[PDB]
Structures are given as C-alpha cells and as structure tokens.
UniProtKB/Swiss-Prot annotation, chain B:
Species of origin: Escherichia coli O45:K1 (strain S88 / ExPEC)
A Pfam short name: Ribosomal_L34
Entry's family note: Belongs to the bacterial ribosomal protein bL34 family.
NCBIfam families given in the database record: rpmH_bact
UniProt superkingdom: Bacteria
One GO BP annotation of this record: translation
InterPro entries, per database record: Ribosomal_bL34, Ribosomal_bL34_CS
Keywords tagged on the record: Ribonucleoprotein, Ribosomal protein
Gene Ontology MF: a single term: structural constituent of ribosome
Name recorded for this polypeptide: Large ribosomal subunit protein bL34
Recorded GO CC terms: ribonucleoprotein complex; ribosome
RNA sequence: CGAAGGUGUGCUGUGAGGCAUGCUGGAGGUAUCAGAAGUGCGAAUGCUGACAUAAGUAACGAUAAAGCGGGUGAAAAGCCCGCUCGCCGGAAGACCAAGGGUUCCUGUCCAACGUUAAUCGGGGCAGGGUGAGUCGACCCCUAAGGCGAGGCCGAAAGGCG
RNA sequence: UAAGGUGAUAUGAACCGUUAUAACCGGCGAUUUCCGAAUGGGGAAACCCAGUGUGUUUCGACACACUAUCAUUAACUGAAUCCAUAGGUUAAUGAGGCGAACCGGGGGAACUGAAACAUCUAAGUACCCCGAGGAAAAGAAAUCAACCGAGAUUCCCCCAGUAGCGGCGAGCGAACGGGGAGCAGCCCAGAGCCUGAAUCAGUGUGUGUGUUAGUGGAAGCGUCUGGAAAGGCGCGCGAUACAGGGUGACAGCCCCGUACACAAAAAUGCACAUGCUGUGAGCUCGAUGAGUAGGGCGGGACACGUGGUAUCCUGUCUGAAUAUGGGGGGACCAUCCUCCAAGGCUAAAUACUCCUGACUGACCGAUAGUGAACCAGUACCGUGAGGGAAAGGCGAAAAGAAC
C-alpha cells in the first residue's frame, strides 16, 4: 500500500529493463562523469526502477 | 650482523597462514581463540 | 584400535603398586589375536580380531549368532 | 502525532521574550522548531565564493524547543494545549478548555 | 555469442580526462576506465556496441588503490581497471 | 538575593579538627541521631601522569674539505642555474630477484619529521602515472618434502602410507 | 504511523511527500558477489584451473544447472574361481562445521600441605578429547530397615565434622533416621480372544491466550530576582496518573510519559471433539535376560589407604543353580527378614547464561567501573602462539569572533 507497481504488472518487462539499463543508466553514468546537474536524483530513480522490474521478473516467470 | 628476521611471503604464508591453521586442529583452535578475542587479523600471514 | 570386536574389550588404565605403595600409571591390555573362523552358511573364513573371552563366547554361542550381533552393532566383519 | 504543525500560529512560553507570538517555519527532528522572528541572533558570515562574497553580520532565527513553544488560540488570547481524538483513523487536534478542532 | 547488453555493464567512465589521455586521443586511442572483472573482448564488444566506432585492440592495466588518508584514520581507495582502446578504422578523431 | 571545589584571613578546642568571611566558581550541598565501610599515606630500588637537576653541558653519526656570481624568497653556507675545486669509478656507476608498497612525476605549503635554517625533501595536501600472443607469474611436468580415497595401526586426539 | 524526509563525522547539490500512497516501524517474501565445514580438482583465505549436460550463436563464443567424502538403503555390472563374494557405477536419505556456561563419558598432572619427603595430600582439581540436550545424568528395588515397618530417581536442611578412614600424622569424612520441594508409572523376551481398544507422536485449521508495530491518556496563571524560572511569593486544578527523562537554575499541571482503557493484516509459541495418519488397549494361560552370578590373580570406586573388609566395575584365567532357585542384611556360619541381577523407556523438583526485554542497587564515576564511557582487542610490540595501551566535559543555543 506504500508503493504501487500496477503499471509494471504487465508482460514484456524485459524490453523496458533493457531500456532502463542501455541508454538510460549508462547515459547517466557518462553524463555524471562529464559533469551534469539534474542527473543526480535520476541515477537513484533509475536504480530503484531496475530493482522494481527485476523483482517483478522474479515474481512472474512469464516476463 | 645478520638479524633474526629475513622476510619472505612464501615461508610466512606456509607457516602462519590460514590454510596452515586449518590443516591442524590446534591451528583451528588458534583461529577460534582469535575469533573469540575479536581480532581484525585472524591470520597474520594473509 | 585394540577392540575385542565381539565383547568390546578396551585398554583400561590403572596403577602400578609397589611394596612401598608407590603409584605409577599402567595400562591393562586385552588378549587380542586375529583369528579366522569357518562359517558354514557364508561358506568362507571370516577373520576377526578377537579376545580369548570373545573366542569362548563364540564357542558357546555360535559364530552365526556372534556375526548377527556384529551386524546389529554395525562393526564390519 | 505531533503537537506542533509545520505552519501553526504559536506563542512561546519561556526565554528570550516570553509573550511574543509567531508562526512555525520548520520543525526539526531534534525536538526544535524555527519560528518567524523570535530567536533573532547576529551570526557572522565568512567571505564565500560566488554568493556571500563580502560577508556580514546578517541575522537569522535560532532554534527553540517544542516544550517552550505552545499553540496560540484565536478565541481566547492565550496559550492552549493540544489534544487529539477521533473515532476514525484520521484524528483531529482539538483545543483544551475550548473543544475546538485546530 | 557477442556478450549480452545486460552483461555490457563494463563501461563505467568514458574518460580519465587527463593530459596523457587527451594526447593519445588526439593521436590514436581512447582512454577510459572499465569495471574490475572485464576482459579485452568484453571491452572491445562494449566499445563497438555502445559507441558506433569499430576498435582495433584493447590494452588493459589494473590501477592500485591509493592510501591518501591521514595518521589518525587510515583508508584505502578502490582498485580500478583502466583500458587503452585503440580504434583506427572508422574513427572521427 | 550564589552550592560543592580552589585560594588567603580571623576566631576557637588538649588533639585529629571546627566555625565565620573577602576573592575565584556557576550547580549542587545534607545540621542532629543512628546504620555500612573500597574510612585517612612520606617511605615498600611501590604503579601511573606531570616537572625539576646535572645544563643551555655532552653530542649533531666516517678527516671524500669547498669557493664565488646570479635567481627566487620575509629571510639563503645548505634550494635552482652557472664557473672552478675535490671523491668513487670490479663502485659511492648501471640492471634485476627477495623484500618494501606509492616513497615515482607535476602544482602548492613550512605548523610537526629533517640531530641547524630551509624557499628544499623519501614531509603535509591535491591531482596524475604501471598498456604484453613473445619479459615473469598462470598453465604442462617433476626432486626434496607435504596432503593423502581405500588400507594398516593407535584410550580419544591421531600416526604411517 | 505520517508532515516531514534522502543513516553518522558532514556541510553542501539534486530531489521526494501530505495526515487520501515521502520517510520511519512491524509480519511475510525477492536478491544475497567471493572466501570460509567449502563440498568439481588445486591453493600461499577472499585466487588458479576445469568436466558433463541444456539452450543460443554474430563461429569469435555466451548463459544456467550439476559434478566432494563418509554412513544406510535399492538397482545395474562384476575378479582370482567354476556358483558366490570382494569391488566398481548410479540414485534417495542423513551427517560434517560453529558456539559462553551447565551435563555424561575417555585420559589426567604438578606446584602445595605434612613445618623435609616417598604412603597420603593437592584431586579425580587444571588441562586434552569424544558425545549431546534445553537441560544432561539417574530412575521404578536381586533397596534400606530390624522382627515394627518404609516403598523409584533428583535436589535442600539436619543427622554431623558423629561413626569411621589415616606414615591412626597432615588430613579425609559418611550413611541410618527425621523435616521438605516435587511426586505418574510402564514395555519386550508370547500366543490366542482383542484388533485404532484408551494413551502417545506428526500434520493446516477452530477457540482462548500472549509475542513480533501501536492508539487515546487528566490538570497553571500573575508577580520579584535572574541571561533564561521549573526558584521565592500569592491564588487554583488533576490524581487508579507525585515511577522516570528532557526543556535557558529545582516543573504533578511545557514535552515525552506513567496509572488506566484499547488494538494485530501476517507469522508464530502454549492449552480442546482436534479431522486424519501411524504405534498400541483390556482378559486368559505360559516364561522370567550364561561365558552371567561367583571364585583365583592385578587394579580401581565406594568417607573405608587391604585391614577382620562386606558392596560395585573388570584386564586375565575359570565358572553355577536356574522360582524344587538365587542375592543382600559390612569377614564368615545357622535362623529369620527382605528383594528378584545378567533387557529397556520415562515428566517434575535440579545446574547454567553467548543472547532478548523490564526493573533494582547504603555498586563505580574517567589512575575508579569492562582491557575498552572516546571508530579498542584499535595503535603499537613479536616470526608466531601471544601481549596490549593512552585518550571524556565550549555554550542554553555555534550565536565557533563579520570588519
């Protein structure tokens, strides 16, 4: 009840897991090494997003 | 004078290392005493 | 170790007592020998380290009953 | 709950000036509140790069405790204590000796 | 295979951002620090996939962690792996 | 409207002691009568910390000695540059293995280490720097020796193989 | 539960959130790198090297799972050796290692005392090892008593520093009997009626009861000193709440609280017809644990040092009767009394605290109390086992001194 993941109870979660890793988390790492300002909360949000997606992957094997 | 300590990591490990302690029950007791004492270095060779 | 394997005799530690009642630790040892007994039902000789009292127990009871008790205890025969 | 809200018109009880009345700015986790224009103090600012380059003696409000700060009542112009009771899971802070919900 | 895009988490920092790195960028090679358990083929596939540029060879060295801490409190920095990514064909620099 | 503690003064009792008060201090003290003791220190070549003495005394670590000009700097015998002079040269030159572990390079600093000063440093603070199919390790193989399935032996542990 | 948060030294930067979904706390999960019993082989801890399968594949290769030893059981193959074993291979189950104290067993000292020392003592103590369990061990008389009787075991107070043992020295030291805590007895050696026939153990529930988050919780103002009031003074109120802690000095009424009342999605510990599954009721007849009791020799334990020494264990050599019978009653014999060894199981009273929570102290207050009030088994010292410190206090609030 504290957190809601009904938007990610869907199937085909592996493609958005891939979009979360490739060109999103990697881009935040490259931009953080170059030096950007708004990226700082975004790395934490993206890491929590991939954690949520991978827990739903461990919940349903259909994926 | 040659002094008593001439260091070598191979003989240091093969004498006073973790595998040398776990080979014998008395070395296992040595590690048990150091774990019960709370030391940061159980094995001083490693 | 020196175990009778039938009666379970073991080395038992005691004292040597002199005329002046000095005490020195000594060991009492069993009369153990390796002996092959002929078992008819297995049609073979079974070698067991046994005591003299174990051999008299075998002669009283039967080598079949003794090996049955041995299988009950679990010691290899 | 908490007897002191994020923005409540409150009256101090002890110290500095006793009688003065203010509104709560920030409630800290230590049991202290910053209230507007009560613990006025003159801190010294160092020369800092970009902002605060010349420095000064510019003023700030210090922290005062929730024990010293009491909730003011509009109906009766004095400090009033806070109780909270409601039958539902959502509670309401009610004034004492006035039976009015804050 | 070519190693998976999930397993291509090796590219940590794209630039060491140094005079030696800029000198070998303006002459020939890209200098960047990658992972701790990466292999040469892993860094090569990572460069060819995550960047558009094809790569000739990758040269890797492991950098030790500095102590860099005072007498009262003792600390040690993390050991990190650097790579020298050599890209000659199909390069823009 | 000033507790315990500290520091002087005055008074008092035979004594250990007590009382009052000026200054410092800025929160405790506990008449009287009982009760329990970690109940009194000058010694033990007593234990711990502080500080004297010798005393501004010995010493500043190979007798391979240095001199000058310029620069920087708050300050130069010691740092940098240059010209002489001297020393080693089967080393006091150069390269590894063991060992150490960042002492290597650059920028800055002089509080502590430098047996003096220090602008300097193997010192403090920040960045850098170690790129291998062929050099070592890893891996193939083995000596001494170690461990040793099963086994033999041994109160237990375990010993040998 | 919530208007505040993104743990601390530690500020910052970018952000999240309304009590209706930030953070915080609790139940159930998910992930859980590598080493470490380490278990695929090895090894100089946290590293090196694989093998067999499944799937993909850009031909460069990638992902995942399994692969240790021993014990039991089952299957398949199988020597000398004809049958058969030993062995080999596979599969299922189980074990390994750690941990402060208590417990049972296997070995077991010496310093010391005797004003020396050897019998004796220290002492079955220290230590080493094996084995568990929440307790362990013991336990339902071949037991004491004395001609009356008691009726398993354990633990406490007496008996009692008595009887006795003792280079009759030093010293060691009972039981009988009494008062108590607690207090139930059963099963096989064998067959029939009897066959879930009570009890007992496992397994999600049902109810009560806690545990692991919580909820509400009374009643003070004015004035003087003071930097600040909780202090002085004056007048009130609550109390099933005047245990305690903090707030600018000492607060019953400022805050957290406390007395009291209430609450558990979910998981769990104790108590019923538990539903079920297994073991197994009750009656009749029959039996009554052989290399055993006992003996000689050598030891050991009984308070008992072999002495007049009964009782228990047995290393060794022997060796009965077998309810027409045997054991004990402290050498031994007769009479008498009492009880059935050579098979087992068993709660409670009992010992202990690595840890969890609440409370208490004529306990300590930084040379004291843990070695450690401070980032302590840390810094240092040693090859190693090992040894092992010193180090608390600004202020109410950093307002931590702009210029």
């Amino acid at each position: 009840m504290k957190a809601k993941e009904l938007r990610e109870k869907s199937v085909e979660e592996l493609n958005t897991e891939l979009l979360n890793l490739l060109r999103e988390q990697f881009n935040l790492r490259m931009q953080a090494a170059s030096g950007q300002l708004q990226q700082s909360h975004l790395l934490k949000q993206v890491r929590r997003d991939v954690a949520r997606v991978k827990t739903l992957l461990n919940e349903k094997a259909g994926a | 004078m040659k002094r008593t300590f001439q260091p070598s990591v191979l003989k240091r490990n093969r004498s006073h290392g973790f595998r040398a302690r776990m080979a014998t029950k008395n070395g296992r007791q040595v590690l048990a005493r150091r774990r019960a004492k709370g030391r940061a270095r159980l094995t001083v060779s490693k | 170790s020196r175990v009778c394997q039938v009666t379970g005799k073991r080395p038992v530690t005691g004292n040597n007592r002199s005329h002046a009642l000095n005490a020195t630790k000594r060991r009492f040892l069993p009369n153990l020998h390796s002996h092959r007994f002929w078992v008819e039902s297995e049609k073979r000789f079974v070698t067991l380290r046994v005591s003299a009292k174990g051999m008299r127990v075998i002669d009283k009871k039967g080598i079949d009953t003794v090996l049955a008790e041995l299988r009950a205890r679990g010691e290899k025969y | 709950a908490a007897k002191i809200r994020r923005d409540d018109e409150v009256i101090v009880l002890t110290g500095k000036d006793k009688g003065k009345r203010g509104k709560v700015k920030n409630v800290l986790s230590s049991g202290k509140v910053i209230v507007e224009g009560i613990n006025l103090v003159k801190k010294h600012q160092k020369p800092v790069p970009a902002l605060n380059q010349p420095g000064g003696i510019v003023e700030k409000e210090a922290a005062i405790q929730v024990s010293n700060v009491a909730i003011f009542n509009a109906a009766t112009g004095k400090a009033d204590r806070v109780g909270f009771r409601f039958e539902d899971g959502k509670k309401v802070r009610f004034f004492k000796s006035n039976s009015e919900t804050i | 295979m070519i190693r998976e895009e999930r397993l291509l988490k090796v590219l940590r920092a794209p630039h060491v951002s140094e005079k030696a790195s800029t000198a070998m960028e303006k002459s020939n090679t890209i200098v960047l620090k990658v992972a701790k358990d990466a292999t040469k083929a892993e860094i090569k596939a990572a460069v060819q996939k995550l960047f558009e540029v094809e790569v000739e060879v990758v040269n890797t060295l492991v950098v030790k962690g500095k102590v860099k801490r005072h007498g009262q409190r003792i600390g040690r920095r993390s050991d990190w792996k650097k790579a020298y990514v050599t890209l000659k064909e199909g390069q823009n620099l």
